Every structure is written in structure tokens, then in C-alpha cells.
């Protein structure tokens, strides 16, 4: 039913960079995602206690949203771009996979991957 810690955004202890991709994966990616109309779902963790959604944490092992995803970024949390492309991409699948095939919520998912894929597919070569 509780929720549960939220995904790390702080340890000293791994290491971090602030590469060119990393960058653009803040200043364009995230920000044309947050913007958008259907942003607000995926701004912040699950609330399994507020949304009435016992079974989510039963279901969905690897949480993740844009909340803490802007939070890496604004940290320099990351090492290189993989490992935030890998981020945006579970926080997608766990949706389809806690949800139905045309749920509103579905359709907003659709939409934000959609233009994540538009954003990603002009990620610059590393300098
Ligand atoms: C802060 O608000 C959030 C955060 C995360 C998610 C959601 C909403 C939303 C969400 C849903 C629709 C729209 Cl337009 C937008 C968002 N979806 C949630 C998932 C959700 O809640 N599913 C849901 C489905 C059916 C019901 N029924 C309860 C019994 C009712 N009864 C009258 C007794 C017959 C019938 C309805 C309840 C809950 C979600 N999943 N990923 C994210 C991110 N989310």
C-alpha cells in the first residue's frame, strides 16, 4: 500500500561528469518534456498512498520519473548520457506496464515518448 524511498539523486561517493550530451539531454530534452501539457503525471514518484494504488510498488521494482530525473541532471549526477536515456525509457515502460492499451494516462506516456525519440535521435556526437 506506504510509499517507499524515492531512486537516489545524491551520493558523493559515484563518480560524475558534465558532458556536451548530458547537457543537451537538460537544456532541450527534459525541458521540451516538463513543458508540455501532459507533463504533470510524470513530474514526481508515484503516490501509491494519495492515488489510491495499493498494488504500484508490488508491480513496478524499478520506479522512475521526470521529478527525479531533472534532479540528476541539475546535480551532475550522471557519469555519461546512457545512463539518463535509460532513465526516461523505464519511467515509459513502467507505465505500459502498470497500465492498459488507450488509458488517458497511456496516451499521455505516447505522447512525451514521442517527442523524447524526436529529441534523442539529434543527441550531438561527444566532443
Ligand atoms: C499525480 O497524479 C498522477 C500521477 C501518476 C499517475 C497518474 C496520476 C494517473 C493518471 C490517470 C489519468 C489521467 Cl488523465 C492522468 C493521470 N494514472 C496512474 C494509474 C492510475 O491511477 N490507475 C487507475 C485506474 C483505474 C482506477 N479506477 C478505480 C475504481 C473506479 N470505480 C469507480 C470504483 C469503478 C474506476 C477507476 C483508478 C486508478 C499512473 N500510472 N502511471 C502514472 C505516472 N500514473
Redesign the pocket.
Known sequence: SMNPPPPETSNPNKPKRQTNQLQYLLRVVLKTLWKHQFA???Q?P??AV????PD?YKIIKTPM?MGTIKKRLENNYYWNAQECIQDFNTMFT??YI??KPG???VL??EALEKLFLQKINELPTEE
Open positions: 504533470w503525471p510524470f514526481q508515484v503516490d494519495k492515488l489510491n494504488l504500484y520519473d513502467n507505465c502498470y497500465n488509458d488517458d494516462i499521455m506516456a
